[PDB]
Structures are given as C-alpha cells and as structure tokens.
Write a protein that binds this ligand. Sequence first.
Ligand SMILES: [Co+2]
Ligand SMILES: [Co+2]
Lengths: 214, 214
Amino acid sequence: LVDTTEMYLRTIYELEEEGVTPLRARIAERLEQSGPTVSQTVARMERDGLVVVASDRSLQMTPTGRTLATAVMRKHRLAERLLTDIIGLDINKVHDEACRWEHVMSDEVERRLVKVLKDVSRSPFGNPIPGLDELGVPGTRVIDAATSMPRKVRIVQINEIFQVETDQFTQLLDADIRVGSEVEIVDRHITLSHNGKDVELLDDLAHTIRIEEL
Amino acid sequence: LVDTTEMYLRTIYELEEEGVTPLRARIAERLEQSGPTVSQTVARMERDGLVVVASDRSLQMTPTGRTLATAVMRKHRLAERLLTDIIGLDINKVHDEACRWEHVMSDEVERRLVKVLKDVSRSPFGNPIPGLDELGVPGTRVIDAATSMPRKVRIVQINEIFQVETDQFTQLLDADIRVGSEVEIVDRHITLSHNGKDVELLDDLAHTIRIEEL
Ligand SMILES: [Co+2]
Ligand SMILES: [Co+2]
C-alpha cells in the first residue's frame, strides 16, 4: 500500500518547497531513517529513474519522479481539506492523518473532492495544492479510459492531424462526435456512442482521441 | 501502514459473517495468496495469540483477534458511508477504496464520522457497522487519555469502590467532579480541572477514572 518511494519523493518535494536543499541527511532526519538506509533507498530510486544525486550532493527529482511527488502532495493536501472542512478533525491531528491517506487515495476520489470542496487552492497550513490540472481542474486516451461498463465522458481532442486513415472522419461527423461532445464510451472493440449512433473505432483513433471526465 | 495481519483478520470476520467456515483455502483464495503463504502467516498469528486453528481445521479468532478485526471492519464501513454519502464516489468503486482506507483511519477520525454522518447503522452494501460502542456510540483511563494539551473531556466513572486511599474523594467533591462532569484533563502529574479548581490526581486514581470524549 504505502510505497516507501512515494515517501521519499514527497519529502524531497516538501524540502524543495520550503526552500531547503534536499540533501540526504535532511531527508534521513525528516524521515527518521538512518543515513545508511536512505543511502540504499536513494540508490534504487536512481536505478528506477526517479532521482539523480546532483553534482553538489543534493537530490534532483527527474521529470517522472517530480510528477509522482506532485500527485502524492496533491492527495495529501486534498485529504487535509477534507479532514478539516467536512470531517472536523482536530487541526493538531490533520497533518499526520493525511500523511497516511496520501498513499491510499485514488485519483477518482480526488476528482470527487474537487467538486464537493469549496476551495481547493491551498492546504489548511497555507501551501498551494499542486497538480489540479493533472486532474482536469488533453485528458486521457480513450484506449486507456475505456472500461467494460458503458461510461459517459466528454471529448477533449480527436487528433485528426495525426491520422493516416481517414475513413472514420465522416463517420464521426455523422454521429456529431466532435470535441466538446458528451459521448458514452466502452471497451468491448472500443465504441463511442452519441446521438443514438455507435462508432466502433480503429486502433489508431482509439489510441489518439482524448476524453475528460464529467 | 497496511498490517497484513489486519488483512487476514478482517477476511476471517467477513467469511464468518457470510456464514462461511473460515478454512485456510478460502482465505487464500479471497486474499489471492498461495496456500503456503497463508500457512506461514497463520502460524505467526497463532504465535501472536490472534487466532487458533480449531480441531476441525477452521480458524477461530481469539478474543483479542476478534477485537482487532471488528475495528478494521468498522473503519472499512464508516469509510464506505463517507465515500457514498458525502464524497459521491461511484458505488462500483466504494468497496475497493475502503479496503485500503480501513488500514489508515484513526479512531479519532471515526468519532468525527459518527457525528457528521446521518446513519451509521449499516454499510451501503447492507451489512451492519460493528463496534460503535467501542467508540462511545466505561471509556478510557484518564492515565492513557491525558495528553500535554489541556483537553476537555467527560467523566464516565470514578471507581471509588476500588480505591484504597480515599483522601482525594472530598477534594473531588469540593471541585464538583463527579461522573457526568465535563472536566479538562492534561498530563504534566495528571490534573483534572472543573469549576476553576484543579485536582492533581494520585496514580491509583489516575489509573482508574474513566472518561469519554465530547
Ligand atoms: Co500536511
Ligand atoms: Co466493503
């Protein structure tokens, strides 16, 4: 369930955000894991293309690693908003609770939260919620888305242109368808448707276309 | 985060509830784990006093194992009610989502859910939510609770008776305280307170006381 890689990744993002250089000792401390352990985990994250240890001994997240981190931070902060706004959990406990929820929330649940919550621009602790765009807010495709169933759606775208073829365209136209538208678608081929118608477608367309869603 | 022991325990509870004999092969199947793996996990759960393999090759949960299982089932079902009633997540996805949330929800979050939800007597799938009493509804203590812071708471118771011582008572008464009451507490010793016053305490008371919460 809890992927430890996601834990390291959101910790680099967090430090980076506070304007701190994400060096291994700071990460070991915040994570409360010995230097040797973080050293081995970073070695396998490099092999996975998630991070690179920069010329200056700091950790630079690769495009893919940054994308993973962002989604974890978005889940974390959407969870905090849900916990304070709707649930009424004591503010002194919101953060630690969200630290666990961030690992099990599906994107489908996030899409729904953006709808039921009135304001998803910042966390209760004053930091902006990242990656809402990646959520349609090219894508986606358707294829993827578608579934079967149917559905429806738307567408856105377609483309056409591319284509080739055409044829268808026309067819577508016729139917118508376209773108826106719505449608439806578925697957079954695928287808678508428307018107009715249907357509278917092819493939291419378917693939492409785308668507877204619604 | 996810304790595998909690996974085995809620699976025994579930079968038991459907009027099925919780034999190891059924559990291996539902869990989609080979017979040898469940065999080793059950061996360590016995050592931990969570279960006993009955004279007829079925698994009998010990008082402590039953208490753990119940809390996991209560979390699971409170999560489902939250997901359908408030969040509006597609009914075809509620169950699998809750299967993960059940492992990270704190009792403090449950106490709040019993307040914000209108009806916590059954899950959307027609089964009663167990252990609400254990929640003040012996515890716790305070111590534990307490824390530192302060707180407050308440208471319940205281016781006283026881114581021894006383012284214181017175113181307480014075213051016043008681129971119921408320208170506060814390721690710082512790204390408580109331009125104013304070107381412181012691231890025892513280322890015891218780408380619760508120
Ligand atoms: Co936080
Ligand atoms: Co369920």
